[PDB]
Design an enzyme around this catalytic site. Structure first.
Site, PDB file in Angstrom:
ATOM      1  N   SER A 195       0.916  -1.331  -0.017  1.00 30.09           N
ATOM      2  CA  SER A 195      -0.065  -0.006  -0.158  1.00 30.09           C
ATOM      3  C   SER A 195       0.819   1.243  -0.066  1.00 30.09           C
ATOM      4  O   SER A 195       0.307   2.317  -0.076  1.00 30.09           O
ATOM      5  CB  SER A 195      -0.932   0.104   1.143  1.00 30.09           C
ATOM      6  OG  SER A 195      -2.079  -0.714   1.111  1.00 30.09           O
ATOM      7  N   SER A 212      -5.798   2.964   4.364  1.00 30.73           N
ATOM      8  CA  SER A 212      -5.520   2.074   3.468  1.00 30.73           C
ATOM      9  C   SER A 212      -6.664   1.430   2.843  1.00 30.73           C
ATOM     10  O   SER A 212      -6.508   0.053   2.541  1.00 30.73           O
ATOM     11  CB  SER A 212      -4.528   0.893   4.092  1.00 30.73           C
ATOM     12  OG  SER A 212      -3.572   0.266   2.905  1.00 30.73           O
ATOM     13  N   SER A 260       1.640  -3.396   3.700  1.00 29.54           N
ATOM     14  CA  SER A 260       1.743  -4.673   4.369  1.00 29.54           C
ATOM     15  C   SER A 260       1.206  -5.752   3.243  1.00 29.54           C
ATOM     16  O   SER A 260       0.409  -5.318   2.168  1.00 29.54           O
ATOM     17  CB  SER A 260       1.081  -5.103   5.655  1.00 29.54           C
ATOM     18  OG  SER A 260      -0.371  -5.620   5.475  1.00 29.54           O
TER      19      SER A 260
END
Length: 261
Positions: A44, A104, A211
């Site tokens: 991201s 995100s 992540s």
């Protein structure tokens, strides 16, 4: 070998994975690099590039950030904390850009992509501002597979650090655009355990975390200490095993080691 690179080397050995760090001290324009030219999966952290690309388009269509975009049940993907609050409704490109950067949101990311004409539209804006290393190839729900050796959706620490500098400190964007990206990054809600945790609490940070699989744990940040030239820091981390847990602690320690010098 400077002292800092001995400390991050030891940190990386302590971690069991692969660490990548790029620091830019705008005062003397010096850099500290650890695996600075190795390729890392962005995850991201890619969301900064695409939001900056929409803001760029805002530099000719003055009201583009105010444009309403429909969110539909077909649009929900893998992880959508904000957009699924507006299913069968609308969000503005402003609210979509805030969602992608500060929570995100993957549906908000995908709406940014569609506005640019596909992932090639994000990669295009990278090349436009001198970034020949960034490449985005997939949309949000699959770009974070973080397969080792896979060139898809990667960039190097050295490249991402200079790019982040140009977007928030330089003049890659107009001033209302550049300032607006800063307000977004300064209100990120996902980076408490990451870069922010290894820095003196008297410092202001705009950051973007990422992540994915293989324990990939990323953070990119712009940092303003209190009476010195600002900083750009990129911390990328990925691990051998696909099922690896996230290691946000490694990112704070890397920031801590960097700031210690």
């Amino acid at each position: 070998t400077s002292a800092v690179q001995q400390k991050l080397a030891a940190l990386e050995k302590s971690s069991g994975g692969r660490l990548g760090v790029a620091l830019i001290d705008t005062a003397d324009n010096t850099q500290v690099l650890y695996r600075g030219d190795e390729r890392f999966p962005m995850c991201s952290t890619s969301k900064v590039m695409a939001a900056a690309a929409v803001l760029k388009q805002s530099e000719t269509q003055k009201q583009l950030l105010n444009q309403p975009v429909e969110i539909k049940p077909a649009d929900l993907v893998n992880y959508n904390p904000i957009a699924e609050k507006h299913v069968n409704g609308t969000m503005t490109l402003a609210e979509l850009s805030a969602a992608a950067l500060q929570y995100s949101d993957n549906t908000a990311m995908n709406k940014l992509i569609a506005q640019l004409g596909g992932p090639g539209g994000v990669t295009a804006f990278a090349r436009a501002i001198g970034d020949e290393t960034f490449r985005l190839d997939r949309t949000a729900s699959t770009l974070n597979t973080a397969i080792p050796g896979d060139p898809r959706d990667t960039t190097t620490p050295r490249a991402m650090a200079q790019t982040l500098r140009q977007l928030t400190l330089g003049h890659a964007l107009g001033e209302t655009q550049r300032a607006q990206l800063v307000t977004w990054l300064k209100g990120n809600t996902t980076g408490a355990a990451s870069i922010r945790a290894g820095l003196p609490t008297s410092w202001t940070v705009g950051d973007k975390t990422g992540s994915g699989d293989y324990g990939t744990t990323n953070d990119i940040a712009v940092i303003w200490p209190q009476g010195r030239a600002p900083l750009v820091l990129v911390t990328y981390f990925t691990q051998p095993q696909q099922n690896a847990e996230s290691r946000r602690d490694v990112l704070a320690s890397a920031a801590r080691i960097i700031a210690e010098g």
